[PDB]
Design a binder for this molecule. Structure first.
Ligand SMILES: NC(=O)C1=CN([C@@H]2O[C@H](COP(=O)(O)OP(=O)(O)OC[C@H]3O[C@@H](n4cnc5c(N)ncnc54)[C@H](OP(=O)(O)O)[C@@H]3O)[C@@H](O)[C@H]2O)C=CC1
Ligand SMILES: NC(=O)C1=CN([C@@H]2O[C@H](COP(=O)(O)OP(=O)(O)OC[C@H]3O[C@@H](n4cnc5c(N)ncnc54)[C@H](OP(=O)(O)O)[C@@H]3O)[C@@H](O)[C@H]2O)C=CC1
Lengths: 517, 68, 135
């Protein structure tokens, strides 16, 4: 229902944005609970120290997994934005939920009167049991808009000074009418805001204040302001205001079950995923996660350097961008002509803006001196990580039309270039781990008028097969056709790159891909 | 990245007279209009058309029967 | 400076503010205009901006306000100093204190005064109505 692009911040096309908070041991073993913009639902999270809290000795790593997000957003909504004061009156929608529980816990500590809306009777009983100070006259119904009459009646027609709203459009409009003079409306939902539903400005004839509360801004900027909320939450933890919500634990392997259970909507408190069991020790010297079996994916170190031959071509630029999404940060593109097209310059400038150290070589791979120079100049950026050979020159025609010079020209970049790259890499690339050569379906399957092309591709395949037998890395991929940039439909680039990843992960020496007509 | 489609446009002004006046011909007999996009002011001006405050919301970009 | 003044009789100030701020917008908008000039003022707001509405025309008429501007952290205020005069006396002291501090610190400087005698009060009313006064 929610598009990944809707999450503020810069995010890779291929990635997961699930999970905002966690709890686990630090690198030194100290137990900590953190708050992250995304990617927090994993066996490891890379986080800044400014978003970590020390877990109290009396808490459990299971309990601390629920405190961060709900209490941080409750404090930001009330104390920082709404500036709640002791003795006021509040209306906190959806009390049972985590944010509602946090807001109620904060409010009761100050000494205000609280009106809360709960969908069902079990949630009402749970809230009544959890917060004894709260009274039966503090409850109402959230799914219906009947809380307006209740709040207005019990408040004597004045209304509620401070409103924490997370309901839909009609419930939002109902909530606005509950505001009293000098009221303050704290909006944490998104549906009405995203849809741009109109809001009558007559409510501002009173001194009402309308607040748009998004917590995702702190992860993106205004850290100087975020430390205020951090101090607030730490003070709440140590004073006793902050209490860990009820938790339901689903083991790591049963994550889908947790998602389904939360989707059903009968949960109370927070749902947590026990990725790893807590050790009895308070501080553990080695907090390394236990080995887990997960689908293989391709990523690259930043310090390594990656080379593409003919990388300025139609497939070369797409492969280069796919690599960068995997975090290459040091790229070398080889092409005799150089940057001659507008699209090439646009892509290169875009990459260099992000900080990538893109490079244009213009150094041939056919000449052994050329291969050595290309490898050397890529070594200057960093140790060579991988070499991709996407250089092609094609001369079409029946055999009677072909001449030895055409065969030599076609085989020079793919055949001789592959040999030179292999030689130089085995001589002076100990750290290299990727050696990919893009063959074609016309070789092997067969095609009319491309004998030289088939010869070159077959030679590249033979070289790649020989390299693997020695234990070195080597991959040959055969493509039926590429559409975006022999009886087979052109293949869209997205499918091409997904297939390329799959092939990179597999151990076979030669692989092929195509789409049947 | 992705497939973004229009969802809201704050205001669009269209004036055929200034459109006819703005158009100019190239070496070919085809007729063209110079366009300018300003992302600071959120305005797109081309010929005799003026679009401001265009809002584009991410579409699912999910197609069925994808190539296998 | 020459880049700080705009035109208040049309919505041209929107482009001026957006351009000279680099497209970010402003933080506080002390708005007194109405109708479309109010909507333009909203578009000038930046993330975490604050809109202070002291004009009571669009508020009285209950004209719609699209809530999409609140996706950006934005606080739309309704400012009416009338409450303090007949109500909110405790809050009055906070405002009264900053006024005394401003007076003693030199920040508060009196405005230009166009004085009319008591017998000519209606002349003062007409002069105000024309709107040519500055100060
Ligand atoms: N700044 C921001 O952008 C942030 C926004 N939020 C928002 O806070 C809101 C509340 O989250 P939270 O209370 O923790 O959520 P929970 O799922 O923990 O609780 C949901 C509550 O609202 C009701 N509810 C919500 N969604 C559903 C659903 N799909 N089906 C049935 N009932 C549902 C539940 O029943 P009922 O109300 O009927 O009892 C319950 O009381 C969310 O809309 C979230 O987007 C949270 C933090 C950050
Ligand atoms: N439809 C397709 O294109 C298919 C693709 N393939 C394979 O994909 C690979 C790449 O195809 P694609 O990029 O689309 O084709 P291109 O025609 O773009 O490949 C040639 C590119 O390599 C450059 N080049 C030529 N000689 C050299 C050299 N000695 N050193 C470095 N660069 C050189 C060329 O620039 P310049 O001329 O200035 O040197 C040009 O940019 C090929 O190996 C081909 O076999 C196979 C089947 C289908």
């Amino acid at each position: 229902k929610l598009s990944p692009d809707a999450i503020p911040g810069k995010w890779t096309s291929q990635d997961s944005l699930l999970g905002m908070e966690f709890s686990g041991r630090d690198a030194s073993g100290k137990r900590v609970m953190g708050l992250v913009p995304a990617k927090g639902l994993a066996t490891s999270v890379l986080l800044s120290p400014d978003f970590l809290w020390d877990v109290p000795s009396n808490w459990t790593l299971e309990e601390a997994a629920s405190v961060p997000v709900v209490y941080s957003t409750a404090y930001y909504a009330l104390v920082v934005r709404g500036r709640v004061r002791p003795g006021e009156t509040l209306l906190i929608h959806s009390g049972s939920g985590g944010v509602g529980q946090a807001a109620i816990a904060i409010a009761l500590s100050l000494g205000c009167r609280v009106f809360t809306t709960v969908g069902s009777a079990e949630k009402r009983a749970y809230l009544q049991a959890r917060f004894p100070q709260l009274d039966s006259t503090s409850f109402a119904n959230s799914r219906d808009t009947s809380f307006e009459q209740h709040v207005l009646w019990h408040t004597g027609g004045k209304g509620v000074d401070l409103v924490l709203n997370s309901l839909a459009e009609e419930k939002l409009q109902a909530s606005v009418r509950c505001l009293a003079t000098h009221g303050r409306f704290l909006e944490i939902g998104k549906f009405d805001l995203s849809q741009n539903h109109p809001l009558g400005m007559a409510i501002f004839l009173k001194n009402v204040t309308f607040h748009g509360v998004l917590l995702d801004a702190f992860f993106n900027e205004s850290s100087a302001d975020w430390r205020e909320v951090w101090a607030l939450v730490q003070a709440g933890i140590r004073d006793g205001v902050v209490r860990p919500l009820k938790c339901t634990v689903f083991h790591g392997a049963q994550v889908e079950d947790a998602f389904r259970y939360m989707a059903q909507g009968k949960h109370i408190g927070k749902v947590v995923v026990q990725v790893l069991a807590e050790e009895p020790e308070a501080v553990l010297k080695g907090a390394k996660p236990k080995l887990m079996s997960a689908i293989s994916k391709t990523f690259c170190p930043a310090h390594k350097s990656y080379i593409i031959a003919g990388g300025l071509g139609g497939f070369g630029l797409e492969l280069a961008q796919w690599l960068i999404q995997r975090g290459v940060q040091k790229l070398v593109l080889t092409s005799r002509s150089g940057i001659r097209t507008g699209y090439q310059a646009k892509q290169v400038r875009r990459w260099r803006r992000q900080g990538v150290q893109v490079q244009v070589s213009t150094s041939n791979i056919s000449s052994l001196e050329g291969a050595r120079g290309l490898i050397a100049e890529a070594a200057q950026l960093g140790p060579v990580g991988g070499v991709f050979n996407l250089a092609v020159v094609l001369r079409d025609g029946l055999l009677e039309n072909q001449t030895p010079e055409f065969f030599q020209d076609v085989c020079k970049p793919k055949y001789s270039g592959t040999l030179n790259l292999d030689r130089v890499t085995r001589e002076a690339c100990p750290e290299l781990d990727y050696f990919v050569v893009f063959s074609s379906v016309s070789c092997g399957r067969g095609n009319a008028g491309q004998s030289n092309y088939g010869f070159a591709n077959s030679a590249m395949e033979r070289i790649c097969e020989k390299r693997r037998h020695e234990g070195l890395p080597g991959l040959a991929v055969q493509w039926g056709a590429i559409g975006d940039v022999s009886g087979t439909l052109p293949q869209r680039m997205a499918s091409c790159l997904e297939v390329l990843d799959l092939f990179l992960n597999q151990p076979h020496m030669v692989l092929s891909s195509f789409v049947l007509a | 990245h992705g497939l973004y489609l229009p969802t809201r446009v704050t205001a669009i002004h269209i004036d055929p007279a200034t459109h006819r006046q703005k158009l100019y011909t190239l070496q070919d007999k085809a007729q063209v209009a110079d366009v300018v996009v300003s992302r600071w002011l959120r305005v797109t001006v081309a010929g005799g058309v003026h679009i401001s405050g265009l809002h584009t919301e991410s579409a699912p970009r999910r197609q069925q029967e994808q190539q296998v």
